[PDB]
Structure 1
Amino acid sequence: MFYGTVSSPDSGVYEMKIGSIIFQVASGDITKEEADVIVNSTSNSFNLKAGVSKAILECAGQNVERECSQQAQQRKNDYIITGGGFLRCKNIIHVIGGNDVKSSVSSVLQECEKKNYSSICLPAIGTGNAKQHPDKVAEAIIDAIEDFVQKGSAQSVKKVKVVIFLPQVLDVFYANMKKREG
């Protein structure tokens, strides 16, 4: 009902259409990416510096660290939105790695539509210190996008890219895309 064909538009990049959205996966350093939103997979205190979260907070800078700790004390948050600091983005959305991944990605998509944003870049949420299994994480990320498209919610969002630290985890995402393709 929604899925296009898997292909490689550039060396090390794999893509398929999901309704009006281009979904892409690649391995590399997410802190070098440019997008309207970059997602950080962190702890329930929004102050983890282990796995990909270490690089994201180091590169974003101390003003972003302070935004995180101020919001964390204000109320009980499932996720928080901060400035981009010294990353190449308009906002960082910090999600909890241990939470349900489909729910976290659904929230990111909704928040990006609220800001009229077009591009998102995320890591393999939950596969760091939270130790969720990579095939369950790939299934959840792609399911969230399918549901968002099915409900007619994609208007401003046009591109969702997963940049993945470990090549072995990229292989799991690519196999999940091939399972779904038209």
Structure 2
Amino acid sequence: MFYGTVSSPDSGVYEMKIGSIIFQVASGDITKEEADVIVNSTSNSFNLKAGVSKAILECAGQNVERECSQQAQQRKNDYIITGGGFLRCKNIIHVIGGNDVKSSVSSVLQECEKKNYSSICLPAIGTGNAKQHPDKVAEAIIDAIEDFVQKGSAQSVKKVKVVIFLPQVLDVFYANMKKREG
């Protein structure tokens, strides 16, 4: 229906088309990535400093931490959008690691279209302190992209990359891609 073939354009990187979007996975440090949006998997108070969130908030800087607590004390947010600070992005989207991962990724995609952005980089959302299972997280991330494509919503978004802290979790994402392959 939408899925292309799984291949490797670089050592340790795996990709496939999902409609007009190139979907990629790799292991490494997400704070070294460049993309229009980088996603942070945080807590419901937007101030977690454990797992990948520690590295993202430290590298982003204190002006970003204050955007987070200022917005947190304004309304009940499901996610928040901040500046990039010292990360190589235009915005950070902070999602709640314990929330439904398909819902969180759908919201990220919609917000990126609203800004006419082309590239997104995210971690394996919820696999840190939220302790969601890696298989369920992989299934949810890829389902969200499939649904966005199916609805004809992808216009500006062309590349979605998951940069994963543990190589063992990358293996789970690769297997999920091969299950879907066209």
Distance 2:87 2:162 in 1: 16
What is the CA distance between 1:145 and its match in structure 2? 0.0
TM-superposition CA deviations, 1:37-68 (whole Å, max 9, x none): 00000000000000000000000000000000
1:88-167 alignment runs, 5 A limit: 88-167=88-167
TM-superposition CA deviations, 1:116-156 (whole Å, max 9, x none): 00000000000000000000000000000000000000000
TM-superposition CA deviations, 1:88-118 (whole Å, max 9, x none): 0000000000000000000000000000000
Gaps of 5+ in 1: none
Distance 2:61 2:12 in 1: 29
Query: TM-score by structure 1 length?
Result: 1.00
Distance 2:10 2:170 in 1: 15
Q: Which residue of 2 aligns with 1:12?
A: 12
What is the CA distance between 1:34 and its match in structure 2? 0.0
Distance 1:44 1:162 in 2: 22
Gaps of 5+ in 2: none
Q: Secondary structure at the match of 1:22?
A: strand
Distance 2:6 2:37 in 1: 24
What is the CA distance between 1:33 and its match in structure 2? 0.1
Distance 1:130 1:137 in 2: 11
What is the CA distance between 1:177 and its match in structure 2? 0.1
Distance 1:38 1:146 in 2: 20
Query: TM-score by structure 2 length?
Result: 1.00
TM-superposition CA deviations, 1:18-41 (whole Å, max 9, x none): 000000000000000000000000
Q: CA RMSD, aligned part only?
A: 0.2
What is the CA distance between 1:15 and its match in structure 2? 0.1
Q: Which runs of 4+ in 1 moved over 6 A?
A: none
The answer as to 2:53 corresponding to 1:31 is: no
Distance 1:118 1:13 in 2: 19
Q: Secondary structure at the match of 2:73?
A: helix
- Give me the identity figure in percent: 100
